Amino acid sequence: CKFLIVSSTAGNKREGVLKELAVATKVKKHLQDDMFIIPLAIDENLSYDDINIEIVRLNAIDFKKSWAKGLQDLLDAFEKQNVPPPDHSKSNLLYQQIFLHDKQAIEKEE
């Protein structure tokens, strides 16, 4: 439904993110909706200049200061764009599946 692209200094010129952004703009053109791709600018050193052409045309969300204000911008933009019962238990059970698999107490005699 939406494509948030991180717009840090490293994340705006790397090859993989560039190709993902390119196919994102292609599917945006296919979907004929301008409310698809959202840049999240987080990096103090990276100004609104020097940013990639493929995202320079679009309106970024200011995550440079107070990441939570950018989070609120993301939330009310999603509500304004009809982006489709919130349950934090899903994230609670998902946090240790991926982020804690090399970091756990596995049974082994020591």
Partner: protein, 56 residues
């Protein structure tokens, strides 16, 4: 064509424009402000043109 457009300096003058827009919507008039109604992740200049010369 039924819309009101308010242009302003973005970094400095926001409180006045926000208050003016809020009062205008309270009065029933439809308004468009870049710090209130300009969507995120959208070509801002193209939408400003559309609002200015299409519905204003």
């Amino acid at each position: 064509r039924n819309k009101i457009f308010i242009s302003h300096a973005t970094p400095e003058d926001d409180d006045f424009t926000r208050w003016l827009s809020l009062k205008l919507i309270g009065l029933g008039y439809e308004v468009w402000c870049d710090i209130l109604f300009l969507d995120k992740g959208v070509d801002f200049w193209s939408t400003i043109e559309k609002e200015i010369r299409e519905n204003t």
